[PDB]
Amino acid sequence: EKFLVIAGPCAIESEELLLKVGEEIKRLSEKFKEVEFVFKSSFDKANRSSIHSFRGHGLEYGVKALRKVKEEFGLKITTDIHESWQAEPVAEVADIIQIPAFLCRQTDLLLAAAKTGRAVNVKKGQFLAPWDTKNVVEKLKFGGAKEIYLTERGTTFGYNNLVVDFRSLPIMKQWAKVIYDATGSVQLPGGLGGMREFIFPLIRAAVAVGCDGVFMETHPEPEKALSDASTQLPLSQLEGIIEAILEIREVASKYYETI
Amino acid sequence: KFLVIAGPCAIESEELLLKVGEEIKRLSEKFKEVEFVFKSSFDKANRSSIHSFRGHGLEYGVKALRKVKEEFGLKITTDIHESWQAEPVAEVADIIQIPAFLCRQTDLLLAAAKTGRAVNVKKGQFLAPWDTKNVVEKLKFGGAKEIYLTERGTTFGYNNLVVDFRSLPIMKQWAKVIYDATGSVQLPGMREFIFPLIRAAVAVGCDGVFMETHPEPEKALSDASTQLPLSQLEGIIEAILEIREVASKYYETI
Amino acid sequence: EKFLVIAGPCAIESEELLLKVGEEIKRLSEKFKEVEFVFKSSFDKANRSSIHSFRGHGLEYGVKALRKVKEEFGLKITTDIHESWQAEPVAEVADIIQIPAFLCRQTDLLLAAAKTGRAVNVKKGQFLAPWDTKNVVEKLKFGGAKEIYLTERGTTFGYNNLVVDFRSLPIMKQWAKVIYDATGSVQLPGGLGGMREFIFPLIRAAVAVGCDGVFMETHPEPEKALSDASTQLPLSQLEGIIEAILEIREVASKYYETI
Amino acid sequence: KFLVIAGPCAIESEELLLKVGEEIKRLSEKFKEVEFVFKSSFDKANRSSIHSFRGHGLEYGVKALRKVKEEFGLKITTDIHESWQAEPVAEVADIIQIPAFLCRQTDLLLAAAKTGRAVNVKKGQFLAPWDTKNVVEKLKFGGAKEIYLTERGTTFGYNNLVVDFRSLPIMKQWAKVIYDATGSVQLPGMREFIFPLIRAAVAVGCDGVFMETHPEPEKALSDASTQLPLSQLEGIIEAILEIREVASKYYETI
């Protein structure tokens, strides 16, 4: 099947940042024709640790900025919702509605996303076991979702640390398409945190094990990002990472197990 | 004074609430030094299965709770799941409770603080003790003056929660600490560990305990495996007050 | 039953340090007559992280120093072994043979300790689940051990950290007397580590839950210790801690569950 | 060259060793770029139950292994459990293996290094990746020149091990890294996860893989739930060499 690459700046810092990233993603979409690209960016960081951190410019502004990206580059769009009422307005531009990791068990939010008729991607909560995602997919199907994805983004491992149990990819694959969050899985919750040096190796692991797509937050200058400055991938490195995982995926694919 | 927050997990009916409320009222009269707070949810908004009991709704719930406060003069507390629920809930709730999974949702916290009520945040199973400092700051920023942090266990491998009692003294630096005696032994539980760990909580030192109690836990529509049998509540309360009395002498300064 | 308080300097830095601690332990044994004191000290730290750290002055010297303590103060003695051949010579002075946490599954070591006829105290490995200690006790009984103790000293929780799951006390109590290691449970493995501020609260928790004794490494000046300098309890604080746990134990005891 | 350490968990008999050794010899001739090392224990010294199979002893074991090296010209490796065993084992063993639980026992490490042989330390389930640096230092201090660190999983809650692949690049800073493909999926296991994770190990980058293989794992006297069926070894080796070939291009510098 067509490999999915979900990527974009963590937060919609501005409509300019988006178009700048969208341009590069469009270029890669033209090169990697065997890949389905989806532009990602949050109109709001509703779960920052500190009340003083950047959240965003609002739903209205965010949706409008995203529609511009889709309009200008013809790229599919995905963004996350935080409360039920947001599903409807977001569904107007988002091809895939994302459910935040902490909210992966909030029934009404999942139901709100599902009835829009859009695809739904649920980030697996850091407190959730792989096999417990079966009920998550069941809620979505109950709610009308026909295209469902489960995203691996790490599991709580002691304090301020996340480990990736790759056994989750084949387990979750039993009931939904699986995406690997290459940048969220290396973050250190409330650490400062994040270790950028592990993004690449862990993503190679993901494609070797086998998944249906990767998720990466990328920014022109991660150092200046308003969110996830420690984990966002420098935009100039995106192409190389993608070529690399496509190569590893190809050679490893004949060995992927049959669920 | 020492806080004791108790009640059935879910508002299965105002009938059940009234029965439990009667017993809590009784204990309330028997333990005058303890501040009792009746607790119950009008909706289990985070059940694993779409086919599980959620409740009878916010309206039916607030009504049932209203009847408990009016018929027994007991303070009330319930949890909210989305921002718009803060205001209507604040009508009856003296303490607005924030679900563990939602302890980082800024808008939910701000909405609860805005109501002027007291706010009790259940500590996420993914959160480190010291990271609750920022949770409190959000509430203070939002106008909350009576803030509580409730220890309910931490993710330990899959389908298991461990109680790191080091959290109590750490969280006490910036907020009053409550120990969730029934939520801490559940397996994302063993009722046999409820009393032992509640004893540990008061020996370590906390500002209150939190317990889900039901006449027939096995028949409860929620947390049937961890809810405390109503008949056992008095005995446990007496026990923890006695332990607290002796142990409080050694609680570390702030 | 008579509460057990196992205490002493982590390592036998010298025979003087031992007599100095032994004197204080003897004084407390005279005061707390409802307590059975056992003087503890390792003749060798065989598992230091660094090859450059203090290990000890050898078995010969250690045993001789311990025999002096027992001889001078009439105090029971306990020390740990690291290999099978050490059981016999150590058994000549030690009333209780201790098995290190990392070695709690080494069959021959456990068997070596058991055949001496001495009591055996096994530190629960940081990798072991509470219920898995049942087989540990079975090995010891198979080997002839008649007086067996299981010591809770924490469990691996993420990297360089240990958490105490107090549910282990009643679980392990099903097949052996249980001891709580108040100083080992707060150490941060390979941290530098240890957090002394948590020793007291966690020990209050232990007696409230209910155990058959406590284990504490105490040194006149923890800051100058050759081992566990970050976790050893200042000797001057020992009396107060003991009085405190006896008080909490008493008031909580009527509520201890029946296994 | 890339290392492939394989063989039956326990030396159930030199008969079994010879059969497995024959297949490993065959692969050895088929994969000339890979350095194969025959592995097997003469004693399961850390079994949970006193009533489980331990082995036939060090003498019978060293003899059986000697026969494999002489009959197939394959390098040998086995694990020691106490210091005195280092010397006699070094007679046959090209690589002395240090059990995971014993990775911190200084004397055991020094005794293995003293023999002049190569030393492979299984990383304790309680050890952080960066703390293996000191393990290597001990071996260097002891005279070891060929040092290996084997990733075999980390304690994750109770009765479970997780493989944190971040360890591979971290440990590679001070020693060659081997991935234990069968020990990492055992539950203190699911064979279905052996191949997926071994693929991940080579995509990330390691200097070799470690696998316990047996003609009939289900009948094996040790690790019957995690041992790889002998017939599947060739296929997995071919697969990991192909993945390595493509992925090695991206392994990070040191």
- Specify the CATH number for the domain of residue D126: 3.20.20.70
- How many Å apart are CA D198 and CA D236, to the nearest integer? 9
Task: Characterize the bridge pairing of strands B154-155 and B161-162.
Answer: antiparallel
Q: Which residues contact D8 (CB under 8 A, 6 or more apart)?
A: D16, D17, D20, D40, D212, D213, D214, D220, D222, D227
Domain range for D247: 1-254
Q: Are D29 and D46 in contact (CB under 8 A)?
A: no
Q: Which two tokens stand for residue C248?
A: 């909490």
CB pair distance less than 8 Å for C255 and B166? no
Q: Max alpha carbon distance in chain A (Å)?
A: 49
Q: Which two tokens stand for residue D122?
A: 């299984």
Which residue type, as a one-letter code, is found at position A59?
A: L
Among the partner-chain residues C166, C244, C251, the one whose CB lies closest to the CB of B197 is C166
> Of the candidates D210, D219, D227, which has an alpha carbon nearest to the alpha carbon of residue D53?
D219
- How many Å apart are CA B190 and CA B171, to the nearest integer? 26
Chains interfacing with A (3 or more CB pairs < 8 Å):
B, C, D
Interface residues of D toward C, Cβ cutoff 8 Å, are: 45-50, 54, 81-83, 101-102, 104-107, 124-131, 134, 137-138, 141, 154-155, 158-159, 188
Beta bridge partners of B148: B120, B176
CB pair distance less than 8 Å for D105 and C139? no
> Apex CA B220: angle with CA B216 and CA B222, to 5°?
145
> Of the candidates D243, D144, D204, D208, which has an alpha carbon nearest to the alpha carbon of residue D1?
D208
Q: Are C11 and C233 in contact (CB under 8 A)?
A: no
Cite the beta strand spans of C126-232 per DSSP E.
148-152, 155-156, 162-163, 177-181, 213-219
Chain B residues lying within 8 Å of C174, measured CB to CB: none
CB pair distance less than 8 Å for A155 and B154? no
CB pair distance less than 8 Å for D141 and C189? no
Chain A residues lying within 8 Å of D203, measured CB to CB: 204-205, 207-208, 248, 252
Q: Which residues contact A95 (CB under 8 A, 6 or more apart)?
A: A38, A76, A77, A78, A118, A119
Q: Are D225 and D192 in contact (CB under 8 A)?
A: no
- How many Å apart are CA A126 and CA A164, to the nearest integer? 10
Interface residues of C toward B, Cβ cutoff 8 Å, are: 155, 157, 163-167, 169-170, 195, 197-198, 200-202, 204-210, 244, 247-248, 250-252, 255, 257
Among the partner-chain residues B166, B199, B252, the one whose CB lies closest to the CB of C255 is B199
Q: Are A3 and A34 in contact (CB under 8 A)?
A: yes
Q: Are D132 and D123 in contact (CB under 8 A)?
A: yes
Q: Are A184 and A217 in contact (CB under 8 A)?
A: yes
> Apex CA A116: angle with CA A55 and CA A102, to 5°?
40
- DSSP category for residue C232: P
- Minimal CA separation from B24 to chain A, in Å: 31
Task: Characterize the bridge pairing of strands A155-156 and A162-163.
Answer: antiparallel
Number of domains in chain D: 1
Q: Which two tokens stand for residue C243?
A: 């009085």
CA dihedral (A121, A126, A131, A133) in degrees, to 10, reads -30
Question: Got the DSSP string for D67-117?
Answer: HHHHHH--EEEEE-SSGGGHHHHHTT-SEEEE-GGGTT-HHHHHHHHHTTS
Q: How many beta-carbon pairs under 8 angstroms link A with C?
A: 11
Helix, strand, coil % (nearest 5) of chain D? 45, 20, 40
Q: Residue C101 in 3-state DSSP? A: helix
Cite the beta strand spans of chain C per DSSP E.
3-8, 35-40, 76-80, 96-99, 119-123, 148-152, 155-156, 162-163, 177-181, 213-219, 233-234
Q: How was this structure determined?
A: X-ray
Chain A residues lying within 8 Å of B134, measured CB to CB: 49-51, 190
Chain A residues lying within 8 Å of B102, measured CB to CB: 102-103, 106
> Of the candidates D29, D17, D34, D8, which has an alpha carbon nearest to the alpha carbon of residue D239?
D34
Task: Characterize the bridge pairing of strands A155-156 and A148-152.
Answer: unpaired
Q: In this structure, which long-range contacts are made by residues A249-256, counting pairs with CB atoms below 8 Å and at least 24 apart in sequence?
A: A249/A3, A249/A207, A249/A210, A250/D246, A251/D242, A251/D243, A251/D245, A251/D246, A251/D247, A252/A207, A252/A208, A252/A210, A252/D199, A252/D203, A252/D239, A252/D243, A253/A210, A255/D195, A255/D199, A255/D239, A256/A210
Among the partner-chain residues D138, D159, D188, the one whose CB lies closest to the CB of C51 is D138
> Of the candidates B144, B42, B148, B139, which has an alpha carbon nearest to the alpha carbon of residue B88?
B42
Q: Are A208 and D199 in contact (CB under 8 A)?
A: yes
Q: Are B103 and B122 in contact (CB under 8 A)?
A: yes
Length of chain D: 254
